[model samples]
Target: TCPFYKKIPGTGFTVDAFQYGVVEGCTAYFLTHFHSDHYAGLSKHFTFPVYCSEITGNLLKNKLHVQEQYIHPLPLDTECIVNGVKVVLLDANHCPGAVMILFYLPNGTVILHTGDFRADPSMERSLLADQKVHMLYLDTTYCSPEYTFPSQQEVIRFAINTAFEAVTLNPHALVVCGTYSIGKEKVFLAIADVLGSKVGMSQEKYKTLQCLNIPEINSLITTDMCSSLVHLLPMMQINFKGLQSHLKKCGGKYNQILAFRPTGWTHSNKFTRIADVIPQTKGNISIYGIPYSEHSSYLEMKRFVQWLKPQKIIPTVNVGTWKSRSTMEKYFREWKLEAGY
Candidate 1:
């Protein structure tokens, strides 16, 4: 049956693709974003329906290219009723297509599912509430003390100052920073806004914005459709090592270049080698390292979960809390669910 209510042994929310039974008959699977992890289970396309906000829907259409026959579109902050359950799609400010799903049962229980969100004050509107939030499906991906990332605002300010300085230093050099197609898009949006009308959107990026249905912020050349414009990439694709190779091929012609890469998760030492590439450039490439992630941080996730005060808080996604067994156990107990508060 659709919308079947049952709890998994060690977590909240019943299993969909788990040892337990799957929740069938749901009006549709509410997709939070177009990222692979969010849509992994739908590879074959489920028999049940699938839904997302218009912006997200268009993005999924482009990324997944599913047949029109299977999609059910819902606008942001609007309620969509399926199988008698009404869901409100809230904005997940981290990226253009990201969203937080609020499931409302006729009885009064409200489940707010945060599907990978970054609470950028200017970007995501607000997900505040006065009513009691019964359950919160949180994106506690960064719930560890070892992981440290600067706020998006801070990272952008650094990028802007450095990018402008580099451009001013060498009128003929081009700077490129790498960011995920989605997360970095906002960084560049801020960058372009700072740059103002002088920027030009590439045909590829223009087409992507058209699908995103957002008005053009500034003019900048983009070579792909529906990409998150955070950092700039070279005109050609190259393997990790090929980054330097391509730069050389372009001819030490450009005075400088910058690249940005925002990873979903980073352990203690794994990123050391990636960061090591910077000094090798001998200060010419101006490689910028900004650990700006889209998902909620440790404190943010904990605070959000506390707000809901749910019977049981489930930490899903690969972040600080999920990686640690004791932390996970404590989360389950912290909600005061084990025996009694």
Candidate 2:
């Protein structure tokens, strides 16, 4: 019985609804992760009790400078009563602070709200062992048939192998990865370990990862330039012109930059396996766009939904004008219809 997309029915809470700035008719806010989209409209003007994982809270308190009094960092997997409503946090497997929330409302209704997350086997085990949920709020970031792609581990492995091959071909190759402010660190981190090189990152990006307390990451990164061939740069630099500018600034310190643009959008080119994927090249720069998605794919979402079988689904992203919602609803209906009643 929810009217607004952000407002959770039968509760005084809103999920990732900071945009309204102390939303009217809501007493609490639940932030499932630290992604900017979800944190939009949150600033010094905000005033509300915010709930999230400890790591997420750290980002908000330290990075964004939100008042510590307003941020409540909760531990993962422990059931707690907040404002008389029972809730538990589970690993989201998307970004470092991302988590799915299970809110046991006072009205005998249980809600499962997934912030951005990748559906995994562990998630299956977790849900199967839990009580049946009433309302399911899902992250429909890649909620389409064409968005399916390789798993995180598989794509990271390919990135490492590609980096190895690039270095083998030319010892002067610098392996650069295009990344968001926080997502896709795992891919480049793995490269640094296996390639025995330090990853050079902008001080800000490096500090944000440090705030997350990623284990062993401190030893594998550098603030100094040219110390290692592995570099992690902003997504802004992933474009060809940026790479070209970067290469010119380096003054021939490294030759043939091997870069990977990791994102969730899977290309439609025919490929039987992950290894068969092609790399686009222009001069000394060979750019590979890998489907290292942080969120669940369309089929992955269907599998999880089929297993959970919630009374209904609520798509969070792409909940646009009437037509988009209707289109998304059709996809969900298709999911159930494909299977026997």
Candidate 3:
């Protein structure tokens, strides 16, 4: 019942899709976020009951149109009974609608499924331990020594400072924040808040933002390119050539471009320290790669595991590769050894 990340143990609730066709024992489906991988096996007419955060439910309605009957919205940190098991949804801190599902089985086993979380230091305070967590379905995407990312607070502060400095240097310079359709929103939104400038986005991106149903974010978005000094674009469009094309579309509203591509691939092994990394500059167009990953860094993973001390830990990502899986298990074993102690 608990082999894959999709199914929470003993609950019969398959989480985050993976129920392509009629899966044999799933009573309900829970979606953590709108990311493609998590929602891979879901379809428009699957007919399985779905449970998720309020915003995620809106995404299912507005973006995917999964019909009204199957979509169920659960409030954050509130206990609800589903299929005779206690479930609590807490903010995942990875995306707008993302959440960590806590399942309390009748047998007294508490399972915390962190469906791709960023491991913000303060987020764990939500747990508040009605009972000790027994099993933890972790986001193991970045649970490797090769990956290290700065905290969201640090990354956002750095982005605001770096982007503001560039814009201040060149009064006509346009700041571009490249991101995915869901995540990496705080970076651009923080910069806009600090600069007191509107964010220009394409129609498609605006539609995705509206799906979030967050007023503070919606108040700063704009569809007109020339009306704002800051623009949001797809990650692929942060390149030197792409910036040229985007600026050409904006006419003379901007003289230069400063783009930030926030991702985990930037700081490899040696240059993980944010100050040690360098930005890519090409004439008037520049791209800075920030290690602002949604997944927990290696150190963060260790800290989280040691703090929770779950009875069992399962890997949700990179589980196919034996080497990666083994490495993650070794860490889990080292931390959760206290279970036997």
Candidate 4:
């Protein structure tokens, strides 16, 4: 079973997706985000009823082509009932439609399932409800101390300024942004809006964005290459061979290229909060690896745990790889003790 999922005892409601054959007879399922890894066994033929945010539900219908009857939309911070359990959807701050699920069981057990999320100070008032959290299913993707990243807003500002600087230095250069198929729409949209230029995307990516129905962003899409200074491509497509060939066709008129890979991995090894923008002169390409992340950093995770003070802490990603349960519990205990709560 995925550690992120929680099936409250005696309550049939389940959060996120379930591993096949792990939990059966689930009355309902809740999705935290549109990320693929979170929906492991889900398909167009998924039988269990699923509920998510309005955007997520739209994605399920238009992108994944899931049947409409199976998809339900839950508004943020709104309380509702599912399978006799009290449920509330709180903004996850990870992506456009992402959420952290808060479930209140009949036995007075409060479970917080943090799908993939970044901890922000604004979330405190919403999460600090009178009910104490009994079980915390944490997003420990960066549980290790090495992963230290700046806030998402800071990274976005850095990326926007860096791209502008690169373009200003080379007026004819094409700025290629690296992003996931769905996660980094905010980055692409922000850059385009600031630059006052249209964003170029492949037909598939364009269609994906169109499904969002966000007028500001949707109006800025253009399949035409020469019309825009920025080209938002899939992370995998931003490489030497592909860019070099594209530049060759443009002739020397377009002489420079700047590629930005915004991710937390850049600072995973180093202690720096600011990511490095290194130049690869071989192809006239400058690549910036920004510390933009959706997952909470080590410090943020610690702060969140201290604030929530859940009775039981469950690490989502690396449960079996932590050597032993006692060791992990000891680590958590020391963290709580250090935080003095």
Model 2, 113-173: lDDT tens per residue?
Answer: 9888888767877743657888889888877777768778888899889888879878988
lDDT value, candidate 1, whole model: 0.54
Error of 3 at 287 (Å): 0.7
The runs of at least 3 residues in candidate 3 whose Cα sits more than 4 Å from the true structure, single-residue gaps closed, are: 1-3, 128-130, 265-269, 337-341
Candidate 1 per-residue lDDT over residues 1-341, each given as its tens digit: 32232232222223222222345332345667766555665543544456776776676566556656666777777767765676677787766777877777666777777677764433223444554566666666666645555566666776666556555666544545453355456555655455431333345444555557666433444543223222355334312354565357444555455554544446632355322423225455545455567776665555555555565455565433434746765765654553343
Off by over 4 Å in 4: 1-6, 18-23, 213-215, 249-253, 267-269, 273-276, 324-328
- Which tens-of-lDDT digit does each residue in 1-341 have in candidate 4? 53434655667767665455446777788888888877667778776688888888888888778899999888888889887778998988887788988888888878888888887767778845556898888887777676776777777887788777777776887888877856766676677777778988778777777766577665688887677877877787667776786677545667887877766656443655455545455558766677678888878878888878888887766666546455557767988898775
Which residue runs does candidate 2 get wrong by more than 4 Å? 1-3, 267-273, 337-341
- What lDDT is reached at residue 312 by model 3? 81
Q: What TM-score does candidate 2 reach?
A: 0.93
lDDT of 2 at 122: 77
User: By lDDT, highest first, what's the ranking?
Assistant: 2, 3, 4, 1
Query: What are the Cα lDDT values of the candidates?
Result: 0.54, 0.82, 0.81, 0.75
Per-prediction tally of clashes: 23, 0, 0, 0
* Pairwise lDDT winner, candidates 2 and 4: 2
What TM-score against the true fold does each predicted structure earn? 0.74, 0.93, 0.93, 0.91
User: Among all windows of ten consecutive residues in candidate 2, which has the lowest summed lDDT?
Assistant: 263-272
On the 0 to 100 scale, the lDDT of residue 261 in model 2 is 86
The local lDDT score (0 to 100) that residue 179 gets in candidate 4 is 73
